[PDB]
Protein backbone atom coordinates (compact mmCIF):
# COMPACT_ATOMS: atom_id res chain seq x y z
CA UNK A 1 0.00 0.00 0.00
CA UNK A 2 1.25 3.46 -1.00
CA UNK A 3 -0.06 6.45 0.96
CA UNK A 4 -1.97 8.59 -1.53
CA UNK A 5 -3.05 12.25 -1.38
CA UNK A 6 -5.96 13.45 -3.55
CA UNK A 7 -6.22 17.13 -4.58
CA UNK A 8 -9.75 18.28 -5.54
CA UNK A 9 -10.93 21.57 -7.04
CA UNK A 10 -14.60 21.19 -8.03
CA UNK A 11 -15.11 24.59 -9.72
CA UNK A 12 -12.98 27.38 -11.17
CA UNK A 13 -12.85 29.11 -7.75
CA UNK A 14 -9.83 28.00 -5.66
CA UNK A 15 -11.94 28.69 -2.54
CA UNK A 16 -13.57 25.29 -3.09
CA UNK A 17 -10.34 23.30 -2.96
CA UNK A 18 -9.99 20.34 -0.64
CA UNK A 19 -7.68 17.36 -0.20
CA UNK A 20 -7.95 13.85 1.20
CA UNK A 21 -5.43 11.17 2.01
CA UNK A 22 -5.68 7.42 1.75
CA UNK A 23 -3.68 4.38 2.82
CA UNK A 24 -3.42 3.04 -0.75
CA UNK A 25 -4.02 3.93 -4.38
CA UNK A 26 -7.02 1.59 -4.32
CA UNK A 27 -8.53 3.38 -1.32
CA UNK A 28 -8.03 6.69 -3.13
CA UNK A 29 -9.88 5.40 -6.20
CA UNK A 30 -12.65 4.08 -3.94
CA UNK A 31 -12.72 7.56 -2.42
CA UNK A 32 -13.22 9.26 -5.79
CA UNK A 33 -16.20 6.98 -6.42
CA UNK A 34 -17.55 7.73 -2.94
CA UNK A 35 -17.28 11.47 -3.65
CA UNK A 36 -19.43 11.05 -6.77
CA UNK A 37 -21.87 8.75 -5.00
CA UNK A 38 -22.34 11.29 -2.20
CA UNK A 39 -23.18 13.87 -4.90
CA UNK A 40 -25.78 11.46 -6.32
CA UNK A 41 -27.14 10.75 -2.82
CA UNK A 42 -27.70 14.45 -2.12
CA UNK A 43 -29.25 14.79 -5.56
CA UNK A 44 -31.60 11.85 -4.90
CA UNK A 45 -32.31 11.71 -1.15
CA UNK A 46 -35.35 9.47 -1.72
CA UNK A 47 -33.39 6.76 -3.57
CA UNK A 48 -32.08 3.89 -1.39
CA UNK A 49 -29.97 2.63 -4.31
CA UNK A 50 -28.64 4.26 -7.48
CA UNK A 51 -27.09 2.59 -10.52
CA UNK A 52 -24.79 4.51 -12.85
CA UNK A 53 -22.74 3.77 -15.94
CA UNK A 54 -19.00 4.33 -15.51
CA UNK A 55 -19.33 7.01 -18.22
CA UNK A 56 -21.41 9.11 -15.80
CA UNK A 57 -18.65 8.95 -13.19
CA UNK A 58 -16.11 9.87 -15.86
CA UNK A 59 -18.29 12.80 -17.02
CA UNK A 60 -18.40 13.98 -13.41
CA UNK A 61 -14.61 13.72 -13.10
CA UNK A 62 -14.15 15.54 -16.41
CA UNK A 63 -16.36 18.38 -15.17
CA UNK A 64 -14.26 18.92 -12.01
CA UNK A 65 -12.05 21.98 -12.48
CA UNK A 66 -9.05 20.01 -11.20
CA UNK A 67 -8.37 16.51 -9.90
CA UNK A 68 -4.96 14.95 -9.29
CA UNK A 69 -3.22 12.63 -6.87
CA UNK A 70 0.17 11.98 -5.28
CA UNK A 71 1.34 8.41 -4.62
CA UNK A 72 4.05 7.72 -2.05
CA UNK A 73 7.07 5.84 -3.44
CA UNK A 74 9.03 4.13 -0.67
CA UNK A 75 12.24 3.81 -2.70
CA UNK A 76 12.73 7.61 -2.82
CA UNK A 77 10.38 8.64 0.03
CA UNK A 78 8.72 11.11 -2.37
CA UNK A 79 5.28 11.43 -3.96
CA UNK A 80 4.70 10.64 -7.64
CA UNK A 81 2.04 12.90 -9.25
CA UNK A 82 -0.73 11.59 -11.49
CA UNK A 83 -3.41 13.47 -13.37
CA UNK A 84 -7.12 13.09 -14.02
CA UNK A 85 -6.75 10.67 -16.91
CA UNK A 86 -4.48 8.36 -14.90
CA UNK A 87 -7.03 8.37 -12.06
CA UNK A 88 -9.89 7.52 -14.43
CA UNK A 89 -7.99 4.51 -15.75
CA UNK A 90 -7.19 3.25 -12.23
CA UNK A 91 -10.89 3.60 -11.40
CA UNK A 92 -11.84 1.55 -14.48
CA UNK A 93 -9.39 -1.16 -13.37
CA UNK A 94 -10.74 -1.07 -9.80
CA UNK A 95 -14.38 -1.33 -10.84
CA UNK A 96 -13.63 -4.15 -13.28
CA UNK A 97 -11.97 -6.12 -10.47
CA UNK A 98 -14.88 -5.34 -8.14
CA UNK A 99 -17.40 -6.56 -10.72
CA UNK A 100 -15.50 -9.86 -11.00
Amino acid sequence: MSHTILLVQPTKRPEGRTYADYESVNECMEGVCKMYEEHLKRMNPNSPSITYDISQLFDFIDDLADLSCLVYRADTQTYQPYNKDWIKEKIYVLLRRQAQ
Binding site: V8, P10, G16, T18, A20, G31, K34, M35, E38, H39, R42, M43
Partner: peptide, 30 residues
Protein backbone atom coordinates in the same frame (compact mmCIF):
# COMPACT_ATOMS: atom_id res chain seq x y z
CA UNK B 1 4.44 7.08 34.32
CA UNK B 2 2.87 9.03 31.47
CA UNK B 3 -0.85 8.66 30.88
CA UNK B 4 -2.05 6.74 27.83
CA UNK B 5 -4.37 8.98 25.79
CA UNK B 6 -7.51 7.52 24.19
CA UNK B 7 -10.01 9.32 21.98
CA UNK B 8 -12.92 8.48 19.66
CA UNK B 9 -12.19 6.87 16.32
CA UNK B 10 -11.61 9.49 13.63
CA UNK B 11 -14.19 9.28 10.87
CA UNK B 12 -12.81 8.90 7.36
CA UNK B 13 -13.05 12.21 5.54
CA UNK B 14 -15.32 12.09 2.48
CA UNK B 15 -15.68 15.53 0.83
CA UNK B 16 -19.17 16.87 0.14
CA UNK B 17 -18.55 18.96 -2.98
CA UNK B 18 -21.86 20.86 -2.53
CA UNK B 19 -22.36 21.06 -6.28
CA UNK B 20 -26.14 21.68 -6.03
CA UNK B 21 -25.80 24.40 -3.37
CA UNK B 22 -27.40 27.73 -4.35
CA UNK B 23 -28.00 26.52 -7.94
CA UNK B 24 -30.98 28.56 -9.15
CA UNK B 25 -33.13 28.94 -12.25
CA UNK B 26 -35.10 32.01 -13.28
CA UNK B 27 -37.97 31.62 -15.73
CA UNK B 28 -39.72 34.50 -17.45
CA UNK B 29 -43.19 34.13 -18.93
CA UNK B 30 -43.36 37.40 -20.88
Amino acid sequence: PRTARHAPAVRKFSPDLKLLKDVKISVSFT
